[PDB]
């Protein structure tokens, strides 16, 4: 009680800062354990890979939606996704199971998200930059793509599919 009490506070306070600063690095730590293993590819590419949104749906691997799953390793497969005012090119995207999809996405108009549902794949796609992520669908089927970024009044309606062939 009252100035006496006050002391006891100033060491509890100390415990709090001690215990609390601790569990935070455990976190900083646990994070880093994700940060060094497979599940880390869902983290956008470092580099700017610049483009010219107003041309990209007309020239570039993003022009032809038919030839946008290009094999690239014995097991690598680049996909050229394009994400525009109000769907995904292409619908759908077929990739194989057990194998490494390296998504490369971009916008021809405004910003979009690309939250491939059931996965960590969750990346803002910006006109004129190329968002780039790794994932491996180890178990196949339908995965809906939602746009989680406002982009106008098609927004609540922007989905598409990943089919990953059994």
């Amino acid at each position: 009680d009252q100035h006496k009490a006050h002391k006891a506070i100033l060491a509890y306070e100390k415990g709090w800062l001690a215990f609390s600063l601790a569990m935070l690095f455990v976190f900083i730590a646990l994070i880093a354990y994700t940060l060094a293993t497979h599940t880390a590819g869902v983290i956008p590419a470092g580099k700017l890979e610049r483009v010219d949104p107003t041309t990209v749906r007309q020239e570039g691997p993003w022009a032809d939606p038919a030839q946008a799953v290009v094999q690239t390793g014995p097991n690598q497969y680049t996909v050229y996704v394009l994400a525009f005012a109000f769907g995904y090119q292409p619908n759908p995207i077929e990739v194989p199971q057990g194998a490494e999809i390296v998504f490369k996405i971009t916008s021809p108009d405004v910003i979009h998200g690309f939250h491939v549902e059931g996965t960590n794949i969750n990346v803002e796609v910006l006109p004129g930059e190329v968002s780039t992520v790794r994932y491996t669908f180890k178990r196949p089927g339908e995965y809906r793509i939602i746009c989680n970024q406002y982009c106008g009044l098609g927004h609540q309606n922007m989905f598409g599919t990943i089919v990953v062939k059994e």
Binding site: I28, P44, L48, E49, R50, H115, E129, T132, I146, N148
Partner: protein, 557 residues
Amino acid sequence: SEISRVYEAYPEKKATLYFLVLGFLALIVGSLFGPFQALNYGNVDAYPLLKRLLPFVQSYYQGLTLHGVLNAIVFTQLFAQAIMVYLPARELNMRPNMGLMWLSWWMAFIGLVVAALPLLANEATVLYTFYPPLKGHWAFYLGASVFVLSTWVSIYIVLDLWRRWKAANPGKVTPLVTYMAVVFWLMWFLASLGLVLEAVLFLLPWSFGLVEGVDPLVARTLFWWTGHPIVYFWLLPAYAIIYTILPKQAGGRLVSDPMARLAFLLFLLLSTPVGFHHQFADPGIDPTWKMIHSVLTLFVAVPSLMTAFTVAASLEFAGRLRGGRGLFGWIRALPWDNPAFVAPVLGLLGFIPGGAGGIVNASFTLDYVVHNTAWVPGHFHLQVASLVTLTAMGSLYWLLPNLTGKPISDAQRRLGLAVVWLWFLGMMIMAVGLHWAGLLNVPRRAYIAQVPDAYPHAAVPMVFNVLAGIVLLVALLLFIYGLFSVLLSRERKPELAEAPLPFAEVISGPEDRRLVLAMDRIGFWFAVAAILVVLAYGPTLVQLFGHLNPVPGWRLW
């Protein structure tokens, strides 16, 4: 001149009040869309109704925008230029300069007024983040531009009132309330360049028609400079209130002067160098710095934690004083009859779930679970529709007497909590819904009612949001009746008003003085704060400023 010598003794209650009125008006209008946007996430389309009541709305997303500018930019901004000048001003019995103090209020009415227009006219439906290339009528960017700059005049008012005191109590420390707001207005100035270099160089010429394009990677990087601190620009006022004021209206005392100082000290260091948590999912922004800002972001959660201790401690001490007793005996000893004391205490319950939220979100990769899902609208409603807002709503009962005159009859005391308890319960119910669908991948920012077959596993949280819509509409409406009614029925009777607003006081120690003395190196810590920004945004900002890649505008509503 006056049958109220009210605004010749002190007209810091003449300016301030106009701040809070504007404020508590913005919060009413914008909050207006709330439960409409609530039932949407509840899977019921309410807009056929709303479009007909207010026939001026055309999108769900236009409301979304009103709700966003008018609750989060205008309402919080106003409520801090209120408190954050008025309080220190009083804790020192000094009058803030009034060319400036009345000028800043013109800036805000001028501003909001200009912006408000495009927005009603649906000529600017790009949301309170207003992410280019979504392009908004030149008139909106000018809105935030001045309105937000009105925080540059007020920084002065405080820092004026800093200079003059220590020119006359020279060699005496800084009184707490003042000491708080000083750093707070300094910190806010570090953050206030983000959106300001963004408005000026990019937004304004673009929207003015003086360039066809903007680079939206940099467009959103300047935003997120400003746009994080800005949540702590909304918080610290209610923190201020809870630190210095709360323990009194709640029967007790601040358990430590310097803990409370420290808490703010680390908020001017770490408020600003932390934008990437919002940019986790950007491309072009090196994985390394996402890590940095993430560590840093966990650092900035360390103030609010000890706050958690210093506050709970106070209320605890206060609880025992009123012959509270049981392990929890201290809680019902509190003045649960007082809205002044209830709103921010419910604020702080609220604050807990909403707290951890930030931290999940805060850890880099765990953002890919929740990012842009409704999870987000969960966390911030918990933090700002709830704590900052309740702390504000609740301020009605000690601030608004102090300010107009007008006491609060048992009737007001009754409505009082009818409002508050409904608000809270609403914010809590809407909380679980929003947070849950959030994990079932219902995107945020979406008119999901127009695709009411698409989130079928949302079935149930969904209900939670429906319900919270009904609840919180019930509570907005009491709030209107309890706002216009504590203002307008005529008890502008003489006496009371005049005051030191209930400051609390402190426990003291030996250790205090040495510490309190070091936290007063305001110029000094303003420096590490400004070392920290430049150290962290600098090496990334340089880069992109060399690969400025402008792309055309878009209207798309």
